[PDB]
Subunit: 309 residues, 2 copies
């Protein structure tokens, strides 16, 4: 009945039906064909035989690449009931991150961004490439996409993507940093510093934390190799301007990453590459630019931000 909560409900309604029915059909493998599908389903306010009930205001629900996401979800270990529950059965909490409404699952596991038709279309083209990545680099840092959907509310189209909340309220985040390996204007806006645990940027990290984050020689090795891979993918996709988001938690489930500190403390660190849906279509930056971006990015992360012994 609120302007936006109007939508929260289509979302909750829609995903419940969509995935609802999928779980009844039997599981098969995913074919190429599957990435290019869009299934649609009409929710009338009076309700139908399939799509019954309401009080939110007449909508159509579009689901993209259902089987692919089913499969991605599995690969990510997100059992359907948990998906459905966390998302459909527990009030969606809105958020104001600086057009583009963001949301969280009541349980903080799932961020839900809206996206512009461009990004959405783009991501649809990422799918197969994404599949090849998941099945080769099981520890990939990329976003975890659990679903892509669209809501037709009266006139226009709201496109949402559903994904992982890299740092959920559950573990208390002592530090948050957001990195690109560039420097310009790469400082926390005064507004942002006037916040609890703020998200700092590259220069901030470089003054505030010159010792950099130290790393057990094994762990280092891994991370390094994974980013080198993720960066290769990202690049191949003519993608840039994405950041390594890093969550440092000091200790003054244990599935983060063990690092020692600038001083001598123990820390459990959480990271993920984020903001990945911005690509330039060849079919204005130079050909070699993304490689440049990923090189710089990778080299930065593994030579400053993270180091060994």
């Amino acid at each position: 009945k609120t302007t936006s909560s109007a939508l929260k409900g289509a979302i909750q309604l829609g995903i419940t039906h969509s995935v609802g029915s999928l779980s009844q059909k039997p599981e098969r493998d995913v074919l190429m064909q599957d990435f290019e599908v869009v299934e649609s389903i009409f929710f009338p306010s009076q309700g139908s035989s399939s799509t019954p009930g309401h009080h939110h205001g007449d909508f159509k629900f579009k689901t993209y690449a259902p089987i692919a996401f089913r499969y991605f979800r599995e690969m990510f270990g997100i059992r359907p009931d948990d998906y459905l529950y966390s998302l459909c059965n527990e009030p969606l909490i809105e958020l104001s991150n600086p057009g583009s409404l963001f949301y969280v699952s009541s349980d903080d596991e799932f961020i839900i961004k809206t996206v512009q038709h461009k990004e959405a279309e783009f991501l649809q083209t990422l799918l197969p490439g994404y599949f090849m990545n998941l099945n080769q680099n099981m520890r990939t840092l990329l976003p975890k996409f659990y679903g892509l959907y669209c809501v037709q509310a009266d006139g226009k189209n709201i496109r949402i993507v559903v994904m992982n909340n890299l740092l959920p309220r559950a573990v208390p985040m002592h530090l948050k940093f957001d990195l690109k390996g560039s420097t310009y204007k790469r400082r926390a806006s005064p507004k942002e510093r006037s916040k609890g645990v703020p998200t700092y940027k590259d220069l901030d990290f470089m003054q505030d934390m010159p010792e950099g984050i130290l790393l057990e020689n094994d762990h280092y090795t891994a991370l390094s190799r994974t980013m080198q891979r993720d960066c290769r993918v990202l690049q191949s996709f003519k993608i840039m301007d994405y950041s390594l988001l890093v969550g440092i938690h000091i200790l003054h489930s244990m599935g983060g990453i063990p690092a020692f500190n600038s001083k001598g403390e123990r820390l459990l660190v959480f990271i993920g590459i984020i903001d990945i849906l911005q690509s330039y279509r060849l079919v204005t930056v130079s050909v070699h630019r993304p490689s440049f971006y990923a090189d710089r990015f990778q080299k930065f992360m593994c030579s400053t931000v993270f180091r060994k012994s």
Copy 2:
């Protein structure tokens, strides 16, 4: 110096260089881009700096989707040195199977068929779909493709594919059957019956072996499920007229399949779907035909050819 052995040597020469150099570069994951690549390398008779020596007669060697095959090979567990050895370092033995020269590795592990430009191009389009299959149905029955290459000898183009010899001399094949789930002219040609262990066809199996091959209830289950998958893929590819090739060995490494016999004997059975590169381009059979083919094929195999208890 023979008309064909002329080629055996380009093949042996070529693969040695191609894959030779690949093993020196470091291994990375495979991107979509990788399926659509063709690397070429010129072998002059006098020899170059790269491509030295000869006595076979001036050729160009084309390698398709190098990284993809490297990766497929790995997935199939075919260590490069073994690949190179079995194929490049041990005389290629020709064969006359009923245009289209076939070959075997001296060690019987690798069949090497020539193929028409069509099939070759077609297969290049199968690649990504094939990748998705390997990474989801690890026990797939399909051909195992280890490589696709072309030789330019004087005027024209010889395209070879390199793949697995489903039944290598190593295990003695007491029976060979070749099945489609159709019936017409699906009898062994008199010529073929006048052979050692002949390859019989559908009707042959149905008279000669009405009890059908019996199967430990677990094993049955698997096979069944795998074919149901393979058939789904095959179909999605608008592919038909492929046969389940089945090798029965009675016992009057043990990595075949355990089955009991028409009477009461123990057998170790070897199978594979074969002849897969024949597809009809939509971009004259009906849309629904391949589904029909795969349905019939699957149902046949699992209701006659193979059964439980």
